[PDB]
Paper text:
In this study, we show that GAS7 plays a critical role in phagocytic cup formation in macrophages. Crystallographic, electron microscopic, biochemical and cellular localization analyses revealed that the GAS7 F-BAR domain possesses unique hydrophilic loops that contribute to two-dimensional sheet formation of GAS7 on flat membranes of phagocytotic cup, indicating that the sheet-like assembly of GAS7 is essential for phagocytosis. In addition to the F-BAR domain, GAS7b possess a WW domain, and GAS7cb and GAS7c possesses a WW and an SH3 domain, while GAS7d contains only the F-BAR domain. The structures of the F-BAR domains in both crystals were almost identical, with a root mean square deviation of 1.2 Å. The GAS7 F-BAR domain forms a helical-bundle dimer with a shallow concave curvature, which is one of the flattest curvatures amongst the known F-BAR domains.
GAS7b (Mus musculus and Homo sapiens), GAS7cb (Mus musculus), and GAS7c (Homo sapiens) are GAS7 splicing isoforms. To understand the functions of GAS7, we determined the crystal structure of the GAS7 F-BAR domain, using the crystals of an F-BAR fragment and GAS7cb. In the crystals of GAS7cb, only the F-BAR domain was visible in the electron density maps. In the GAS7cb crystals, the periodicity observed on the monolayered membrane appeared to be absent. The monolayers showed the striations formed by the GAS7 F-BAR domain, GAS7b and GAS7cb, all of which indicated the sheet-like GAS7 assemblies with striations similar to each other on the membrane. The zymosan phagocytosis was rescued by the endogenous-level forced expression of GAS7b and GAS7cb in the knockout cells, but not by the GAS7b ΔFFL2 mutant or the F-BAR domain fragments.
Residue numbers in the entry:
A (entry chain B): 173 to 475
B (entry chain A): 172 to 474
Write the structure that this text describes.
Amino acid sequence: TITINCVTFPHPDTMPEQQLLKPTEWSYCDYFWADKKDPQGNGTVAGFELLLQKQLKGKQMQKEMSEFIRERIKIEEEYAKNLAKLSQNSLAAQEEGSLGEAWAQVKKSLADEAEVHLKFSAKLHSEVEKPLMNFRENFKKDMKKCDHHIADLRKQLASRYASVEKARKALTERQKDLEMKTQQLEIKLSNKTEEDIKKARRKSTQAGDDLMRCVDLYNQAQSKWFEEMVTTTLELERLEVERVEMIRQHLCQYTQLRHETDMFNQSTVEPVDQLLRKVDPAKDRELWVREHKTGNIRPVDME
Amino acid sequence: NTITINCVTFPHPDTMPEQQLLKPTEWSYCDYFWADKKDPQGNGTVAGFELLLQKQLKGKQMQKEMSEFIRERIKIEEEYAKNLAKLSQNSLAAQEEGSLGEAWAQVKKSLADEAEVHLKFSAKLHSEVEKPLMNFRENFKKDMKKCDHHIADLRKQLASRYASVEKARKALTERQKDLEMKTQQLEIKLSNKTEEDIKKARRKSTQAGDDLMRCVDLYNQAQSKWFEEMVTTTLELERLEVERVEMIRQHLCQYTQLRHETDMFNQSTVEPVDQLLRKVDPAKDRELWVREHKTGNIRPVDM
């Protein structure tokens, strides 16, 4: 059995299968254990720190997306401001008659249009922009605490590692104290030396009692970092899936708003179309000749 | 017996028989404009046709103004499309990888597609609605002011025949005074000179009558040419106007049509986005990332 950076994997020999925790589905709690070194020589970080960077970049994407929608909204606003300003414009005003009414309704239909696109800007803000920004508001914080809570367990792993090395030398280097009492008692021997085989053999029996406790507490405070590793990577995986589905959801609402917006726009012409059917040249000629006529009597001769 | 205003003779405002309307019901230009009209004040008191021209003119004016309105719309559209295009190239949330990444990418593109649609529309507007409003009877300002002097000239040529009659009706009566006042001077001290003078200033009272004859006959003629020409070249105006109306109608109808199909093609630019959002699978992405960034594969043991 091997040991790299204070965590003991079994040795790369006759490896008993190793059943994956969560099969098929590429679990965060399965494919991240042993650490990884930065391609250079330094920056050799934890088999988890990447999960944080993924999480943080995630909440990051999220924000950039929202910023994008803001830009779209600003665009929209302006488009509406302009259609509005044009809709108030004084052009071709004095056109009288059914045709006049018709033009007028065109000039108005630009205002309707303006509204539609504006309302759309607002629903963008409401249903797409905000819920992206304000989704898990402080999250880089919850993540950076969820970080060093692991880091701390890895430190409490490394101290038990040092604790076993400076209590493994205690055994092996004081086993010279069992060997130097059968090899170096072979000179004097049999005297009041009730200490060479009795006492100094204990530094090879008290030091077994050292490595026992230190490897017990290493192995304990490892499979305590291990289990809180499993569960708080699963918590990440879950939170991630959740993020994806949230973004997907709100993007679907972006398309949805788009869709229904365009639909309400292509409808602001129906009043115009409606008035344009009622446009009758001859009726207008009436409503005008009535109002401006001069005499209906046709001249004769003399005297 | 029969009146005469501004050199044109209508029958007296008594019980004048019916007056068959030229073109009945339909308020024909050649029916309700004969007698002139005064500016509501006292001056200026203008011709009973000038208004028909002024209307034609206001017409081609309206026409222009309308084109200018559409222009503005087009400017607006051009801009909106430009901005949507700039945003479509925008780099936000780029590093989102995975099926969600592709989906987001397609959102950013749909803005370009959209932009395109709105531009294609600004164009269809310029071609099919703006231009045809400006360039409808391009020289109309020419043909109207020729059509003016054709009536106007016949009206001067009338007022002149009228003056010719009046100052030759004065001729008559003043050579009838020189008759009663020369027959009255016969009945006083009767001689030769004041007899031959009665023969003479009495033939001079028939030449003034055979003169008044022609002057009135020619008045009547050069009236019933202004009459005829009035009728038919008013009808020409009525026609032109109507033609205008339905031209404008038609092109507005097309404004709405373009509006319409524009919004329809816009509401289609989301189908790549919707289609891609359904292909969003968190677990698939977790696979494509855990594959490329995995480290540990093997899970720790004891000692």
